[PDB]
RNA sequence: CCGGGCACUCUAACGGGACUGCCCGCGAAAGCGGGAGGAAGGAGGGGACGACGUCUGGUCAGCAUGGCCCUUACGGCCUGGGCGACACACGUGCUACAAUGCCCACUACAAAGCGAUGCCACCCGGCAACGGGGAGCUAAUCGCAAAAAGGUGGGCCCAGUUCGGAUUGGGGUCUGCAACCCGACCCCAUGAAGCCGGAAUCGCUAGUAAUCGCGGAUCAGCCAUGCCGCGGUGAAUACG
């Protein structure tokens, strides 16, 4: 963990506080999973990437501290049988 | 031991009471290379053979070790048909070594919590004759009894 | 008051060099306090002695420093010039400070 | 005599006692005594309903425990899961939730071990 | 290694954390000694011929 | 044990310091 | 004045002075049983005081240092084995039957790559 | 600490020293036993050292290199992912199951190595990781450093426990562009399996095995319990 940090890449950071003041909001797709989220970022659905496709991820307000590449998951499972 | 004989590690006479039996003694009790504890509890176990006993500990250790020293035991021998169990008497040598052996085996067995009264009341209940490390030196000679019977395979 | 470090990766040279040092200094003018070793530092490297796969199996070597001390107290400018132009050292390092 | 929900400590020491509670130990309870200036090497045995009940309002008041403080661990754990996030699915999956491997042994969060053919 | 990789190495600007020892003799990147810039192998191949100053097999 | 990070014995063996094994001397 | 000693047990060396007197002995400027107290083997340190009889007869200065206790301990005991037979050096006598005028050339065995710790080996394994 | 000496310890170069060379016994000799030497014997202990060859052994992914193969790609740059996946199965290990033990306090004794792009004394802030400050050292000259077990004192009283610390919740620290996947560390909480392990099976012959700590290489940091080393204490047992 950070401290004087809380790291956010400025990449979606600037689309995002670009989304609040337009007044129109929609669906954005980033690689940045080592961000972290919010609170401009709630309500908004953006796309991860898990290294294959870009999921979209509806953010909601107790998604906070967490970092995007949390809601997206990198691997496949389902079991064994 | 192909070669040699191989000759036996020849032990620095005890400081306190002056005596070699006893080092091999305490060698015996000690785990993991501490001498300090090996002595430091053996010495206790004397403190323990005083103020509860009045005879003279080192007079006492000298004995339950000569009541516990197995007199014949029973080894095996590979023969023409199958592997046998051969009654022959414990060399003087190793009559020893199996003494102070059992005598720790036997004392860290007994229930009482610390070190050196087991120590104690082992070598005690050793030395009266009705200690557990001696039922180990009957009963090996006892499985001697029994096989008598192929004691004409002894070497 | 100045003293002379010495340092190399040989000591049949090192001394070799402290020695010469001595009487260019001694016979060469004011007192100089024979050769005092310093210990040796030994920087080693242990490592897998083939390509693939031999874990057990390592040779290793060493690179040793070797430090030699020769203090001088009294100054001729006999010594100071054979200690600047009369230098025959190879693969041998010296210092020298005046505190 | 019995702190926060029932939990009867007894015999033994005090400030031994007190870990038997959920929510408190080592330190925790260290802490407590001086605080509520009790001697740690008394016995709950025997001691004044005195100082019995100072450390019982002190405890039962400072931190939560074991009812409030179970529940509130189990709606962290339901709030990892339902939102989605990763940390959840491995609750979710019985799985282990901080790194480490689970091609070998995860067996206490994995339970024992179930063989297969192969 | 390749040839992209060996020069790569070289050209270590842009967040100096990826910046990594490579061997100076072959493109290898494991087992380089920070002193020599060799690889392990190197460096036994070197110390062996006398081409490493001072350098000698030790025992004990 | 030496694995029990909360003691002495803990911390020595993991090679750190703290409010268990505090550095002094 | 006095008399000296030399010895050393496996990396540990001690300096032994014996000038006579009461029979005080000091260890590294303490009396030998606060730094030594409660160690088993300590007062075989100076066996060959009582082996060659001298006993209330030397007090004694020693510095000690490298090894351990136990090993600084044989050293000093190597150190009254020398020096007592400076003094009347036919003290060789009794004393080299004894034992006591010879090095314990007894040191750790190194370590040796691919063992553990350097006779110990890894566990087999054959599958 | 100062004067002062280096005598000793030591430091690190150079020699010395044991050769079955001496005595008795055996013996045809070579050797073998035994003796007294001496610090040391019967190659003193430990290294480095590995014959002609063997396994069509290992490695085209260190490198080199014949042949075959790809050529807007089988080459090249990037962002992210994966190598860290988990019903399970095996190897090597660390930590244990406790009272020759655990905890706290006080108190001792090492060696080898590393460090002025670093090691960091000492003071302050913080329970702490750490952060402020900040002197010394190109380093037998300052630093890493506390060695640990041990010792003394006190506590725990045989209990799944002051055993054991896996798991999980919360709170932080540091490196780094960045610690979701995948970091290490500190604190609070949580305290799992575990009460000496079926058939089976490994290591070790002496300063060894056990046991206790310490350094280094790689390295931003680190999944090191690994490896390569260092010394502390220090057994048992070999008829055959
Ligand atoms: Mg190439
Ligand atoms: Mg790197
Ligand atoms: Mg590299
Ligand atoms: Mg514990
Ligand atoms: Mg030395
Ligand atoms: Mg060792
Ligand atoms: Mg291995
Ligand atoms: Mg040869
Ligand atoms: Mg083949
Ligand atoms: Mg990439
Ligand atoms: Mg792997
Ligand atoms: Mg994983
Ligand atoms: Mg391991
Ligand atoms: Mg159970
Ligand atoms: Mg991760
Ligand atoms: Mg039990
Ligand atoms: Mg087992
Ligand atoms: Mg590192
Ligand atoms: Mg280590
Ligand atoms: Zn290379």
């Not at chain 4, 450390?55 to 709606?75: D, F, P, S």
């Given at each position: 963990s950070l401290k004087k940090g809380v790291f956010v890449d400025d990449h979606l950071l600037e689309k995002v506080l670009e989304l609040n003041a337009k007044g129109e909001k929609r669906l954005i797709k980033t690689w940045s999973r080592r961000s972290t989220i919010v609170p401009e970022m709630v309500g908004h659905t953006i796309a991860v990437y898990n290294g294959k496709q870009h999921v979209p991820v509806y953010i909601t307000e107790n998604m906070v501290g967490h970092k995007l590449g949390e809601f997206a998951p990198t691997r496949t499972y389902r079991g064994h049988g | 031991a192909r070669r040699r004989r191989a000759e036996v590690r020849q032990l620095q006479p005890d400081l306190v009471y002056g005596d070699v039996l006893v080092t091999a003694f305490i060698n015996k009790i000690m785990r993991d290379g501490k001498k300090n504890l090996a002595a430091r509890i053996f010495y206790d176990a004397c403190k323990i053979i005083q103020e509860k006993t009045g005879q003279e500990p080192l007079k006492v250790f000298k004995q339950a070790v000569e009541n516990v020293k197995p007199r014949m035991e029973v080894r095996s021998r590979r023969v023409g048909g199958a592997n046998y169990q051969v009654p022959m008497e414990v060399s003087p040598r190793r009559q020893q070594s199996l003494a102070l052996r059992w005598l720790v085996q036997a004392a860290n067995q007994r229930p009482e919590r610390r070190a050196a009264v087991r120590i104690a009341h082992e070598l005690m209940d050793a030395a009266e004759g009705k200690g557990g490390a001696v039922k180990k030196k009957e009963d090996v000679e006892r499985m001697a009894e029994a096989n008598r019977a192929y004691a004409h395979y002894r070497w | 008051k100045i003293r002379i470090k010495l340092r190399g990766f040989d000591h049949k040279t090192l001394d070799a060099s402290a020695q010469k040092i001595v009487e260019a200094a001694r016979r060469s003018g004011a007192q100089v306090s024979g050769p005092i070793p310093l210990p040796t530092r030994v920087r080693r490297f242990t490592v897998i002695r083939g390509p693939f796969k031999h874990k057990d199996s390592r040779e290793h070597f060493e690179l040793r420093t070797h430090n030699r001390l020769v203090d001088i107290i009294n100054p001729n400018r006999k010594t100071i010039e054979q200690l600047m132009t009369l230098d025959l050292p190879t693969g041998v390092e010296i210092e020298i400070k005046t505190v | 005599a019995r702190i926060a929900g029932?939990?009867?400590?007894?015999?033994?020491?005090?400030?031994?006692?007190?870990?038997?509670?959920?929510?408190?130990?080592?330190?925790?309870?260290?802490?407590?005594?001086?605080?509520?200036?009790?001697?740690?090497?008394?016995?709950?045995?025997?001691?004044?309903?005195?100082?019995?009940?100072?450390?019982?309002?002190?405890?039962?008041?400072?931190?939560?425990?074991?009812?409030?403080?179970?529940?509130?661990?189990?709606?962290?754990?339901?709030?990892?899961?339902?939102?989605?996030?990763?940390?959840?699915?491995?609750?979710?999956?019985?799985?282990?939730?901080?790194?480490?491997?689970?091609?070998?042994?995860?067996?206490?969060?994995?339970?024992?071990?179930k063989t297969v053919a192969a | 290694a390749r040839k992209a990789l060996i020069e790569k190495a070289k050209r270590t600007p842009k967040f100096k954390v990826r910046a990594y020892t490579r061997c100076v003799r072959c493109g290898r990147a494991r087992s380089v000694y920070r002193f020599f810039g060799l690889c392990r192998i190197c460096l036994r191949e070197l110390a062996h011929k006398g081409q490493l100053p001072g350098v000698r097999k030790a025992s004990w | 044990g030496k694995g029990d990070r909360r003691t002495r014995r803990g911390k020595i063996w993991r090679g750190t310091y703290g409010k268990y094994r505090p550095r002094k001397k | 004045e006095q008399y000296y000693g030399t010895g050393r047990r496996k990396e540990a060396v001690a300096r032994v002075f014996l000038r006579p007197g009461n029979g005080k002995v000091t260890v590294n400027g303490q009396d030998f049983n606060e730094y030594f107290q409660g160690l088993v083997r300590a007062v075989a340190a100076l066996e060959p005081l009582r082996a060659v009889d001298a006993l209330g007869h030397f007090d004694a200065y020693i510095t000690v240092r490298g090894g351990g206790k136990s090993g600084q301990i044989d050293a000093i005991k190597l150190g009254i084995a020398r020096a007592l037979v400076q003094y009347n050096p036919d003290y060789r006598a009794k004393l080299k039957p004894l034992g006591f005028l010879t090095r314990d050339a007894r040191v750790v065995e190194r370590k040796k790559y691919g063992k553990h710790k350097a006779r110990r080996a890894p566990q087999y394994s054959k599958r």
């Open positions: - | - | - | 029932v939990e009867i400590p007894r015999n033994k020491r005090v400030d031994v006692a007190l870990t038997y509670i959920y929510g408190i130990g080592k330190a925790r309870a260290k802490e407590a005594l001086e605080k509520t200036g009790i001697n740690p090497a008394t016995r709950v045995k025997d001691l004044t309903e005195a100082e019995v009940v100072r450390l019982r309002e002190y405890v039962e008041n400072t931190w939560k425990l074991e009812g409030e403080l179970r529940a509130e661990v189990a709606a962290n754990i339901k709030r990892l899961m339902d939102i989605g996030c990763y940390r959840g699915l491995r609750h979710r999956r019985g799985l282990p939730v901080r790194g480490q491997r689970t091609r070998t042994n995860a067996r206490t969060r994995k339970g024992p071990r | - | - | -």
